[model samples]
Target: MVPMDKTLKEFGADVQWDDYAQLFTLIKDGAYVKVKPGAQTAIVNGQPLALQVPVVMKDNKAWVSDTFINDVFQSGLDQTFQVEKRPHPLNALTADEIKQAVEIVKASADFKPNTRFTEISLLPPDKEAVWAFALENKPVDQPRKADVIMLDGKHIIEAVVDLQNNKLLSWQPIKDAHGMVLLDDFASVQNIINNSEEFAAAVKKRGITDAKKVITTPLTVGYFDGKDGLKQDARLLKVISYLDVGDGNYWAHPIENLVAVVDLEQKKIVKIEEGPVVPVPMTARPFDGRDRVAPAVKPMQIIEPEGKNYTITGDMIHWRNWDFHLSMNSRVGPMISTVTYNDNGTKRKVMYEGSLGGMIVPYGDPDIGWYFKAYLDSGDYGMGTLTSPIARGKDAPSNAVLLNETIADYTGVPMEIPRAIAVFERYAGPEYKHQEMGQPNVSTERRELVVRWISTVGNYDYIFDWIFHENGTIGIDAGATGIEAVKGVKAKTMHDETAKDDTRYGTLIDHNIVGTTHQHIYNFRLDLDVDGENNSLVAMDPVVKPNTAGGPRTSTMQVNQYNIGNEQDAAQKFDPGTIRLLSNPNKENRMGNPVSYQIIPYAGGTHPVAKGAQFAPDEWIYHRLSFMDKQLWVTRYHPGERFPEGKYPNRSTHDTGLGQYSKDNESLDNTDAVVWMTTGTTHVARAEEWPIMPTEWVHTLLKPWNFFDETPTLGALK
Candidate 1:
């Protein structure tokens, strides 16, 4: 049936299904409510129970709640129904945890007092190699007891991570066989190589004659025994797919993470490989139907006693082998994300570290080290589980994610089980804010229902809690938050329809390109107050400084945050820490309620940032946050897509959901949130940003600023 016809009062819990036909004129026949995930179906007061429908938003349009039947008839519900609004688990990080992680890094043995590294117009002049060699992995070995490392050739570099103290020393370059060669110092090599037959052959093979396309393709170096000199490996490193209408303008041209391996040691090209596995819709190929277990085990539970406060008890109980188990693990620990920048025009290998990304959740049994421990003195928050291993106590693994089980729990409350279990995907997204809930959206009694529980979303992966107040206000207190860092932040709006609208400030959206659905995105804008408050926003000037440890150390703003999305951008691969902070509220618990904050730690992105003040304090900065969606859709917008008439006539859906993005191809402006504000320090691009990255880091924060009241109610409590 068409939307905009259902009355508001029809959405109440007591509305009858037979009444929908009389209420909605669009209903040609008696309609049925589509049963959704986590919703229950029972006989209430002798009448078949039906879940109270809520108003869901979809692309400027609102869809009301329909009927819901348990298992018999489940249709009319669109999976892409995006409606809920809450904080993403990865958008936040507690103050205590941030401090502890920083302290550990400072005390680490790898921590170097002298930090000097730069990208200069210095190249290893062999009268041949124009580009720097590609450094795939790192040091070949890790945790070495070394003071300094050098890339004697192109692929070789000494590496050492102080396992004893967990600090990094220093990275330098030594003389090559062809003498002391600096990177980026080129005069004749650039011209000779481009004009060479070798370059021409590569261009023709890829069916490109434009100099721009030629230069855009990856150009790396191959180094053998040095006797063969330098060989140019022009294998493309990215998968370019676009909808080029050839109108001199493009829409959403996606560059996938596919790389052609060029073996420098063998001085020959090898094979191409797909990279950065993102979460996509597909059955698990290697579906291992084994229940993972280890020596360590503990059980935890998310319990609510009488009021608004909720507890993820490390002291709860769970049943796994048809036996009872206790959970008693709590060791507050620290988590960190090290962000580095790769600048333009320099020896790419100078600071080139190895490739990194993936998800790392500590799960298994209790007897072994796999057991979780929360509330320890190590840091402010601990990962893994809330309780210790079974050996230490029976109080861990406190939460045995229920899957393929009954819809009724030991408690008399309703229970709704999920279909899928234990699967996660990753993607790149915009920064957003979390805020407490308010009227017409959330009610006071719903805020404080006695003994509410939650399960997971999509699958039973995890549930994000939606914290609400007594006066109809909800807040997002995620268990963990994610962090990430990338290279540039130039604001360039996708389309300037009104021209008065700055192309760099606003956001955009579209449909069928990525997917279809109603999505409400909360954006963020982070400002780094460097050099104190006097010159905060204008501190983005490039830095060329001298360090006490050595000569000059490049300084710039680096980001280390994470979030949740598809599998292509998983945190572990790009930087898993981001997943640690992103919370998914779709996952529910035993009582057929949703949990809070599926905490993410880190994610990965571009590099090199400049310091500056924010454009707006309130307009663009997202502080308290979360989003509630009725369903999800896989967004698939490509480059140069025309504005389809009737559906996506406007420039709202450009890339993902945002309007403006960075002009630099190397950067990403995940088109989602309109405004975003994550707490972190920005910096001026330093010489170290050139070519690749150093073991640099950035410190960020997310807390309840002024989002709450002095006493906790919307109005003063009586």
Candidate 2:
């Protein structure tokens, strides 16, 4: 106090009080502003940039107004790079809901993440061998963990998943049993071709053409951004987890973690590897062509309960609607492959496996149509199709037969078995006038076919027996229902202009603008001789014999593989010649192996005839069905009072014109028919989906009917 008249330094001088440290100059839009120690501001995009009154300074970093931000530089610094919020989180993003925030990250343009990983396209070599394998080593109980393997051409990748913990533990590339490491990459593909004897021989054999000229199919290694960007430069091969939109897909059924194949030379995605997007021929019902507007399934409620885990269970057809119940299998990651053999004094274990390239899950058209309705009205209720529109209260036909009498036997047990099936019949209203909408009248025609599917999923033995009538076509798909594919859409459906306004549910735009009108799916799976039995790729290469009414070898052709929806890409061209069988389908890895599979018929609109008419493809669709997998289990629904979580809001209170029971009804049990559909370039959504998109979750539903006696009628054992 005695020195109060001393210099300012002795009192407490402000270093920032200097004239140069203040906000001084003012500027108009498109002009610059100089900040002096007292004030700050800025001009952005030809407009004056007004800053907050109080500027912020922390951790040696200053956040000033636009006007002062440019002036608050150190020394002679004049410019800085715009920091992207992508590739990293601004902060820890602390929150319990962060894990479920795909909507948040996915909504961001740069946040393109993968949603599926289609597995290998291999069929059981021998039905008997597969059956033997299933009988030899079937999974006794719900396994806590399982190992899988998948091989593409010569390259291989192996992986393992802990079911109980639900985590992918390992994925590695191993040398083949014959000391061959067929890791396909830009650098090694040529080396393997020049040195590997087995690879050389396989190339010469070229089962597809038996021509050696095809030996040089380009082997590429790269990554697809799912945003139309592909990177294959070795310097950028930093393994990262990106939004795995399957290569050139059509639906929202995006894969979660598929390996993107980038063509460095082409600077674009050539093809999606490591997925179930195999080449197949179109095999939909003749009456239900690709153009038909599929019927609608009942919508279901999809919610994450207050718990520490993600549980997706439902009470639909065999309790298997288009819900998340069976939607997260196989797609969790790539399969594992191993070649084991005993050599004198050493144990040979050649393990090769990796994530799938992509998968195609063609849902029932009717279900998709129903989803369209729910998605259009997300305000009243979130979008989802898990039930039917019609209802039958506590009554059945007087002459209806009693098929199921126990709840456990009707709704619970079948679901527990892990199979898919639904039971439903026509519902008669008061005046005997049908209230709910149904399929149009068509010829009731029944056709049966045997289908065989081979992959890491398991031995899949499916018998597709369809009944086509003037009313519609119904398929009785039977067997041990296989697992489900990851749910996602392709790029075209995501960017279509038609979807520009509908933010909740819309398809993308593409060259062809293919739209998936509707579909119906019933999966039959068989888990046979899983670990070591029935593990072989036998190639009987059945020679076609002349049919009584045909000439040289009945040129009808087998329905090996198929694809439906819009067809604009050369790779997606419909053809049965692309599929082949293994020469010797009998073999197994010394270590344990796991497999699961399903058969899907993609339907939307019928193929355009040169004459301008649409026609269905199901007339001659059937599989040479057989199951030799080491195990087989058929699961379905066991009738009960009702599924607790299964309830639709009664619309009578809200929309008067709308039906009443259509709102809060349960269609989990007595589901009638499953109609599958595949939307092509037609599916779309809009801009409001920006930033953080609300959950745009869709569903596969099962419509029920009151057609049986005391309860609904299914199979006696079912």
Candidate 3:
């Protein structure tokens, strides 16, 4: 008979094997089937139908009946729920999977009455197995598993669940680690502070009589070794209250000089740090800018006269030569995975996955509420949880196809954020052009497809854009917008006597308010599978060399290239002067150059580029993080190793992140490499950024460097 892969390819079906479960999963666009090596009854989507004969396994392939495609494709039509489609193994956990995982954990030995789930996500299938399914039609016998991280107040419990069978595969306790705060804690702490007589008295001293009128958002009490007066091992949050006047902007009216430590487990206010009260700024600062009289601009439409040039099958996107699965991570926001590019007729693997590894917004000011304001927005506060629901005309253009995102909350229940991500196409520039005297000019317009995701972390709204171009280039634009985290100050104007001191920490942006200086640093974890899995980090620097041949110039420019072979040395800050690339040494372009993608962490930014954290060596933040300081860290892939910062970084006492991750100093030469590029802006607040700041963008890129033989966008001329 014919080959199984070739036969399935004709019908456009693909096969994946589950070795442990002894099932062959065959998937078409919207069709899914699971059959054992020798089973007459095959599970099609959810229904089991009788097959012609037992599935065949010959010398080197999986074979089946001739009508197999017809049998499976004609089997299903159901619309029950809205979760990420499971076409590939790396898709986020479905609604059914989420409920199943929680049930399995509840019945496990690690289950406690007070157990609360902080994260329950897909424990991605083995890397090699996934590649086999993606690159080849080979069967992968790996069962689907879920990674579950939970907390009993502060103690952390991590578990792996076998989703195929309701089984708990493994469990471990992360000792002496403070797991992230649960969403329930957000509401619970507010309840604890509002009814407290002591808290009411503390608020009264701050010129606010009613405690209920005070909106307190619990913040992570960073580790300061008893200096910050926080109980080292206790699950606690320092509630910073803001006076909520009739206006919606409570952030503008911060109730300064008072910090309330609320113990989550005890559900009571344990301690209060009372300093001199600074009078609350009663000025109405509505972020909506409703008072401003401005004319509405004339409406413009962005429409495709014919149809879109891209195709979205399930969650998989195929635009021009680019093909990838787009999904949203609870912590990382929009993640692009299994990226492949079609060159002519050949499909080549480019990247496995890419997303925000970790983000830290560290305020420089050391005031009571400001000192502990180093926020790990994605890890400590969930990105998907804070996903701002985007509007049709305001957040995105008229032609954008907004997609609703799904992620489980702290309780392992699926929560949907409507229009959290927008996939749109836009004109970028000219791709290529040529002109000669009295000759016809040749030119091609460049088009780009971008996936946009926005997460509002307290006072700042962070936007992520994964941009794809026809010329084999990817641009990641990180935009920061929203009101700056302004501090309550006594200075009414810049000329005031108290202005200089207040202006020392930050610029006096408005009356009695100063926008503090801070660093919004981000590390994007890009698992660039250049060509294949094996890749290397290569650095090329231009040096001046003496010319042997006698000429007017005494020196000539020479380029030197070197491969970084270990993980430790690969971790370094970005230098725009030198060229650094993630290369597949095993593969070569037509001209014998190594297939590579240039990795520029700090491509450019609106604000001053952050060298790292602005903290001194003795600063508590230095002990907890190292990724922010270094711009690039290339390491071998490990399923558990995703975030640049450790999995549980809420109240970590020491560095469990990139610093610990590269401690082993593993070899990085021609391995399945994961590239982490840290980049961001050191925001020295100016008067222009206050009230409500416009979006300030920081751009990064993974450009083709000898990855293509020639200009890949010449076909755009059509």
Candidate 4:
């Protein structure tokens, strides 16, 4: 045993003993711990936490047990959470399981030695079986299979492994189309440029010496009919670099109008496209605002001292009456599945799965280096590979409990993104407030559980929030922030004669810089089973009808409610006035109305709505993707159909995604279906969004209609 005072002091903690109260205090970095001589529980930062052993006074000295450091100090980090079992089917495979999956693949007859895993994830168990297991109390007896995609040189191979049996179940080859670029390919792009004699000599012509100071962003070369020298059969990434002058923000100094087409297989720069040498902006443009004077702002503390309302066991989350499973995928970043709402005592299924089907950040600028700049954030580059970790008191509120996720890297190794997701509760104003002129006011606070995740794809960081409300409303929000891709130009100010042409496709956000106009579009794949699997897409169009029973006003608004019938007809441009809903005909409320949840992708957006892609019909991009522009597309649910932007979007020649999925012309007559909501913003960069763009958010909601008999929250209100 050691004296408490001397030990705490040695550990950089301010030790103090209260004479009258007989309490010992240890303070460090704004957090304090209070201990009593005999009590087993200690107060840590005003919160009581149990200690392994209590301090005892011996020979007039307060002595602590040998475990004091671990018990009292390390109590902040209670335990290292470990996964014991696969509690849910969609728990995104454990580290041991990932290692085993790769083990079997390597041991197989068709195994390739020099292969790199582009994606390794759970082969989603049967959808019907999952729902039955989730709601009907049936056992999850489905196959525990792993989906692994590998890239050996230029060829992409798909392997299915049965985790339970530990065998490579099947093998298939992806023809023509190139797989998504893995995190491994990224390092080679930089290494290829660094070791290349061609790239260094070309930059030297623009008066550059050290090529080591260059930070390159590898871009996908879109199809251009042999004009850009990008072969249809070849897998390539067009590399562009920025001059890092040790000013912290390398993106500010753009090595303008230069392109390096690097063949990944060859591991060298095949071609270098050069343009006019606009001088690099040598100004100290710190994106983190390190040079600016600090602004005084009070902390926003969110906590419920009693405990959290939600309980997360493994990957399954239960908050209030809602229950769901959250998973991270190599392709789709994060997904919320098996969402259910407990109605009174019955657990009713709301959705089978909800995930980011695909996302496209297409730039509007049409220059040699800028034209082929449509980035499939999730498809082209694996979104989960770049999963940004969340920090307490910084990225999220202090009260949030951060969660870790495990996914296989390009080398078939388990990679962990510690604190990759954050979950917490927030007060979202009053759920309902009503009062008569002479009556008392009735109100109850609206608390929402937010599940958050983010991915940093090159220059932009996309934050995704899956918020659940007690009122049965599910809100999906995507916020775009981080550095705006800027181009260096000779025009330093608007007064300069060259400013007019330089700012043609973009706005001059800073001196000698142009923030290129672009669009951040997202399509969420929602397998919503409002009450059951049998549901129909219903349209409630509010049309002005002539007032039959005459009044002073002639025309009156009347809603036309009808089923959309087929998958092809369900795909339509969203009309804000026309409410689209996923209605279950089998389920009904106290009244005769059918139970439904409103599908609103374009609820409201700060940037102009991307009604359609900016490119022409004949443009190659038209054949590449179809989910970017159209707001809604309903299609028959097929187990194989997952990604909206096709499986292999990298250098894809045709619309193999939703465009091909919708062409089936299948009838949505009480059959299982998936709804794809394409929501986005046509971002026109402004001066204020320069240094680092403030998180510009676009929201989508699945609101309740007559799903409930009356106000389900009435009992909670008073």
Predicted structure with the largest lDDT when compared to the true one? 4
Model 1 C-alpha lDDT per residue in residues 1-718, reported as the tens digit of each score: 1233344234211122323432211111112232222244432212344445533445634444443222212332211112324211111122232233234434545444422111110111120111111212122222212222222223222333343344544333332211111122121223333444554454334334342322212222212222223223221111122122232212222222322333323333344334342221111111122333457656432321111121211211111100001111111111111111121221111110100000111111121111211111111111112111121111112111211111111111122223111111111132223345673443222232111112211101211222222322212211211111111112123333332221122122221112101111111121111101111000012234445555456543344433334322211111222212211133333444322212111111122221222212221111101110100111122222111110111111122121112111221112211112211122222333321223233222222111122322333345
> On residues 24-135, what C-alpha lDDT tens digit does candidate 3 reach at each position?
7665433456788778788754667787766788874787777766655564421211243446777778888889999998997658887888888788777777766666
- Sort by TM-score, best first: 4, 3, 2, 1
Candidate 2 residues 265-303, lDDT tens each?
A: 233333332333212111221221334586887743211
lDDT per prediction?
A: 0.21, 0.22, 0.82, 0.84
Which wins on TM-score, candidate 2 or candidate 3? 3
* Top-TM-score candidate index: 4
Q: How many backbone clashes does every candidate have? A: 174, 186, 6, 1
Q: List the candidates ranked by lDDT, beginning with the highest.
A: 4, 3, 2, 1
Evaluated at residue 198, the lDDT of candidate 4 is 83
TM-score of 2: 0.20
- Candidate 4 residues lying further than 4 Å off, grouped into runs, are 1-39, 43-52, 55-86, 716-718
lDDT by residue (34-93, candidate 4, tens digit) is 889989888865678776778889876888887887676666532223243546777788
| Model 1 alpha-carbon miss at residue 392, Å | 24
At residue 639, give the lDDT of candidate 3: 73
Deviation of model 3 at 415, angstroms: 1.7
Question: Per-residue lDDT for 369 in model 3?
Answer: 77
